[PDB]
Write a structure and sequence with these properties.
This is part of a larger assembly, with seven protein chains of seven kinds.
Chain C (H helix, E strand, L loop, with lengths): L3 H15 L19 E3 L9 E6 L5 H12 L5 E7 L3 E2 L8 E2 L3 E7 L21 H14 L13
Antiparallel strand pairs in C: 1-2, 2-6, 3-6, 4-5
Chain E lengths: L8 H9 L12 E3 L6 E3 L5 H14 L15 H7 L7 H7 L1 H4 L11
Antiparallel strand pairs in E: 1-2
Chain F lengths: L11 H8 L6 H10 L14
Classes of the chains: A mainly alpha (146), B mainly alpha (45), C alpha+beta (157), D little secondary structure (57), E mainly alpha (112), F mainly alpha (49), G alpha+beta (204).
Bound molecules: magnesium ion (20 copies) and zinc ion.
Zinc ion (ZN) binds next to α2 of chain E.
Chain G binds two RNA strands through α1 and α3.
Chain lengths: 146, 45, 157, 57, 112, 49, 204
RNA sequence: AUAUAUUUAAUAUAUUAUCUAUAUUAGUUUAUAUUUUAAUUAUAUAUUAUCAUAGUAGAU
RNA sequence: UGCUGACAUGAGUAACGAAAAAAAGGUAUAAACCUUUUCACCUAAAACAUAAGGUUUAACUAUAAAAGUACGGCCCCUAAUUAAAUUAAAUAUAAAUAUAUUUAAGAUGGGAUAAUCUAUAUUAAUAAUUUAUCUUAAAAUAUAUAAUUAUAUUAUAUAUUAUAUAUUUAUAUAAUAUAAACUAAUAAAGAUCAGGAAAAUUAAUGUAUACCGUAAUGUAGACCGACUCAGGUAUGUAAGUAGAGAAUAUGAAGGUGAAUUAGAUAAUUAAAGGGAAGGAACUCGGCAAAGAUAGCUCAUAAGUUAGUCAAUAAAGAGUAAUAAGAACAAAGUUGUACAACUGUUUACU
């Protein structure tokens, strides 16, 4: 520890002027740089495609299907098993895929309703259930045929 | 200074008291059966 | 010849050129998938070239990519998985603890930029008026957690 | 204060509604040692390597 | 160290409300405020008038709300894309409803 | 709400317990329910299973 | 043996001697905090990161080297190696200024959130990226002032650079061949990013 | 350096105000220090303050 | 000294848990929330990275992003060990079972390559217990008269320039270029206490890169302590100045100023500072509290089991210092009883 005694030794001979090397890089900065306000990215720069496949997750181009713009359960009816029974395999497959697609759009919407607004209306849920029923019927018919 | 006798480590606890440990040994099986008969909801860690 | 990454890239490019799959289709066919994916709104951190979905907990990254291509004709270039913690929730406090779902989300980078349609004004759409349910909740809370002379206190909700 | 509407010392927790609860509950991916791997019926796809990698089939 | 017996209703009453010291006095010392004839404590500035003055000062000596240069001409759509409004936690919500836990100064009666 | 409950079904046993409340203690829960609903939503008639 | 091409700051002379890549600067996003990291090469080590983030705090955290959360934002091709080097230096200087010397001024330009912190979603802060764009632009301008291959900025995303009007329409830029060609999405842009970068380099 | 008025033939002189004492590169891995190189990046300047048991001691 | 519930009494008493706050503005709503400025506190931490742990506590529901290279798990491989598992008749035993032997499991360990970026798959053939890196030698720098004296340097870690060979890309050579610390790799080598186990090469053909961990908290309000408990809790970095050091002082940066405030400071208590003349008269007993005239370099007796054991000896000196003047390391000599000695012991007398 430092005390009354303390003889501080010098640093170094710092290699006499002539002996040093020239620095590999000479000119560094721009000694004149201004701090300018940032430049936030704008959407005008984009060209969002109209027929972009992710629009297929919405009904038409619409955030939520309004209560008026939903198919009411008075009109909509799920597919019957017997009726399905006389349908080709390919057609059945197509139907299934359509159903799935519909569910996805409902599903997203349903999630939005539940998580954010916190609604309990459950029209979307009901629709999804109906779709699921149809799907299961289809599956049953497929099994049955085999 | 006593009091802090439980020093949690998930590995040790699953390995010693866990369902799989219980089910592997005959005594453990007895314990699980006992808990089932009592109707416990949780048969072991 | 050349190294692996480069080769992969080349393959992808070729696929794109063809107008088919930009990835090796697994020789493992499922005809009737019951899976569904939720399209989520984009976070501040996501670009317009990224979209993300809630997908099945048992969904593979590859599977998601495949699924998007086949069902929706969407080319997901890069996919990133994010499994979320289930937090303990409990209703009464006299009722048992249990964890909420482990939920799986996936971000995908596509070529073409998408943006969502702007959310409805709180009136034009019956469903997405977020106030009424909140009000109801508040009312319920008031009803439950008012004990004595707070019964007289005028309703907030 | 932790939360300014509760000034006085109540029976309130720093977070949540009860410290205790049933600990004997199915564990998820998030809990455990580094070595604890749970998995989610996602990959019986390929085969692990001798060195740590994964070769898809 | 410890009470030998349960202290009777009488005794406790007389210990508490008995002596003068322990009783709340009536605030006799209060008078009209020269600026608006409301009640105020004697030897004390009226809390309404002073508050008003402070408010006026604030309005005058208001600091310039340094709004950023970019965000002023930032398209609404663009803004939405950039900064989407999240859901706040319970705690945050609680904090926000200040009216619930925070008190605004009451106004006195008019002195006569 | 902000839950993700809809995407899962967890605490199945618990749900069953709370869903299938014994019918002799149905008066209890119903009373509480009645208490915690506005006058326009509530109805005097008893639900059927 | 130990020192790789990334290990040290590399001047123009070194580049000339080597000629690994064309004269350019790479700029990366932190994809999670929202920070931005400049570099003379398509890879980067700890040292560079350290240099960039000398005085971090709760708002400006020293980011990790987490391979995955560093995605390439910009690749700016110039004419001369020396020019590129200068640009890089300028960027660094700007960053330093933002951090320590003139932090207050920088703050006075950012977006806030009622409380008065810099606007965030999680720990992601948008402003840093914006600054990096603006800063980059400024650096470029400076370089051109100081000052045939036409210069170009290859963007991850067309969106990220504000607009062709307002900014990026200075006369100096116009006078030179400053182009704004977006990088090709085509394949995987995260996994096969290095390959893409290499390809780009080869192209020049 | 910038801002604001002045004189000069936006430029330079001088006045006032504000801000600035940094930073980058070399010297064989790292970190620090030194010296060079870069840069406007400084005073064996006056006066203060904080901390070190009231920092310690002499008076009070 | 019944049991359960309710409600009293002490009592509006004690306490509100190591503590530095102030103003202005949010907000004629704020001691306690947020922002700015001032002041302070921690700083080989109260910081920054992490492990474990846990009511997700986070900068949150629009949420913690990975083919891999100073990224971890799984996977391969085993240790300690474990396994109603495996050999007319493995052996033994009231049953349960136990045993040796195989097989499988089992991390806290081992596991190709890689910014001049890297490919693990399929088929065919035939390591390390600890510890030190001295002395010598070589060459270099100065004095003096090839040789002497004195000094530092001496195995590795890049960049630049100049050369010779394949043809600006390669190979090798020469010259140039600080200090004290640290790291890794190299070689050599001393001690007795003698220092893990386990999974081959070439050629041809290949590759679209799975799953999970990732917030924040982590010497703590987010773990274990019944509590937002002065306790317990693993690892790395830990700005300079100073110094032998991670001692001690400060503190650049970062973080923090708290579920009690405001006044008043009686008696009295705790934790400190000072004290004239005395100096153990106190007391069971100098308990407690004082008390350090270099921390570097010299110099250090008796006794002794010959070990500077005694020894950091006491005393004493050198440098510094002449009465005003940091913090931390460092507090005497001797006799006797008992026990050789370093150790261990009644977690909580
Ligand atoms: Mg206990
Ligand atoms: Mg055992
Ligand atoms: Mg606890
Ligand atoms: Mg954990
Ligand atoms: Mg990668
Ligand atoms: Mg201090
Ligand atoms: Mg009785
Ligand atoms: Mg009393
Ligand atoms: Mg008292
Ligand atoms: Mg008191
Ligand atoms: Mg306290
Ligand atoms: Mg205020
Ligand atoms: Mg230090
Ligand atoms: Mg931390
Ligand atoms: Mg094994
Ligand atoms: Mg504590
Ligand atoms: Mg006496
Ligand atoms: Mg005596
Ligand atoms: Mg001492
Ligand atoms: Mg002894
Ligand atoms: Zn008045």
């Amino acid at each position: 520890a430092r005390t009354k005694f303390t003889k501080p030794k010098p640093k170094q001979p710092v290699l006499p002027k002539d002996k040093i090397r020239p620095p590999t890089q000479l000119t560094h900065h721009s000694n004149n740089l201004r701090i300018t306000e940032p430049i936030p990215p704008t959407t005008s720069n984009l060209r969002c495609p109209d027929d972009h496949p992710l629009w297929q997750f919405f009904s038409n181009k619409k955030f939520i299907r309004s209560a008026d713009d939903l198919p009411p359960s008075s009109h909509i009816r799920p597919w019957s098993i017997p009726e399905l029974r006389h349908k080709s395999f390919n057609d059945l497959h197509s139907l299934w895929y359509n159903c799935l697609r519909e569910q996805n759009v409902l599903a997203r919407e349903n999630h939005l309703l539940k998580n954010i607004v916190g609604s309990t209306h459950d029209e979307f849920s009901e629709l999804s259930n109906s779709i699921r029923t149809t799907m299961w019927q289809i599956r049953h018919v497929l099994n049955e045929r085999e | 200074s006593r009091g802090n006798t439980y020093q949690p480590s998930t590995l040790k606890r699953k390995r010693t008291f866990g369902f799989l440990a219980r089910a592997k040994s005959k005594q453990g099986s007895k314990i699980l059966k006992r808990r089932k008969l009592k109707g416990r909801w949780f048969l072991s860690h | 010849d050349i190294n692996v990454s480069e080769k992969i890239y080349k393959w992808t490019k070729a696929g794109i050129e063809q107008g088919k799959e930009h990835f090796k289709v697994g020789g493992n066919k499922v005809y009737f998938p019951k899976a569904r994916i939720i399209l989520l709104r984009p976070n501040a951190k996501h670009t317009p070239y990224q979209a993300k979905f809630i997908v099945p907990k048992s969904f593979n990254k590859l599977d998601l990519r495949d699924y998007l291509y086949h069902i929706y004709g969407l080319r997901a270039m890069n996919i990133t998985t994010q499994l979320l913690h289930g937090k303990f929730n409990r209703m009464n406090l006299q009722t048992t603890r249990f964890r909420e779902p482990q939920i799986k989300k996936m971000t995908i980078e596509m070529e073409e930029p998408f943006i969502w349609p702007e959310e409805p004004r709180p009136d034009e759409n019956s469903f997405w008026d977020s106030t009424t349910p909140d009000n109801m909740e508040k009312y319920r809370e008031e009803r439950l957690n008012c004990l004595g002379s707070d019964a007289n206190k005028p309703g907030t909700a | 204060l932790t939360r300014p509407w509760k000034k006085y010392r109540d029976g309130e927790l720093f977070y949540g509604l009860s410290k205790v609860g049933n600990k004997r509950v199915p564990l998820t991916t998030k809990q455990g040692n580094k070595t604890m791997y749970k998995g989610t019926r996602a990959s019986g796809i390929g085969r692990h390597t001798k060195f740590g990698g994964y070769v898809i089939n | 160290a410890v009470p030998k017996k349960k202290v009777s209703h009488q005794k406790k009453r007389q210990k508490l409300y008995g002596p003068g010291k322990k009783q709340l006095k009536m605030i006799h010392h209060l008078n009209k405020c020269p600026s608006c004839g409301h009640y105020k404590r004697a030897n004390t500035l009226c809390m309404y008038c002073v508050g008003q003055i402070s408010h006026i000062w604030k309005t005058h000596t208001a600091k310039e709300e340094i709004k950023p240069r970019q965000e002023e001409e930032l398209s609404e759509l663009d803004q939405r894309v950039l900064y989407p409004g999240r859901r706040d936690t319970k705690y945050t919500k609680d904090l926000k409803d200040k009216d619930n836990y925070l008190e605004r100064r009451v106004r006195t009666l008019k002195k006569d | 709400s902000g839950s993700y409950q809809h995407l899962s079904n967890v605490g199945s046993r618990v749900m069953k317990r709370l869903g299938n409340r014994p019918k002799n203690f149905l008066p209890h829960s119903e009373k509480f329910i009645k208490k915690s609903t506005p006058e326009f939503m509530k109805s005097d008639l008893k639900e059927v299973d | 043996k130990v020192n790789h091409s990334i290990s040290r700051f590399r001047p123009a002379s070194w580049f000339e001697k080597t000629k690994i890549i064309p004269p350019q600067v790479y700029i990366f996003r932190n994809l999670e905090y929202g920070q931005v990291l400049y570099s003379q090469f398509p890879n980067f080590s700890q040292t560079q990161v350290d240099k960039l983030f000398v005085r971090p705090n709760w708002s400006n955290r020293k980011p990790s080297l987490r391979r995955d959360i560093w995605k390439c934002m910009c690749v700016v091709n110039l004419q001369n190696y020396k020019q590129s080097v200068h640009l890089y230096q300028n960027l660094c200087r700007l960053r330093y200024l933002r951090d320590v010397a003139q932090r207050k001024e920088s703050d006075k330009l950012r977006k806030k959130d009622s409380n008065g912190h810099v606007w965030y979603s999680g720990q992601y802060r948008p402003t840093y990226c914006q600054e990096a764009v603006a800063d980059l632009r400024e650096s470029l301008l400076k370089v051109f002032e100081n000052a045939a291959k036409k210069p170009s900025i290859y963007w991850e995303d067309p969106w990220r650079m504000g607009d062709k009007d307002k900014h990026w329409n200075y006369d100096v830029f116009n006078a030179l061949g400053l182009e704004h060609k977006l990088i090709q999405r085509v394949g995987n842009i995260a996994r096969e990013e290095s390959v893409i970068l290499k390809e780009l380099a080869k192209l020049e």
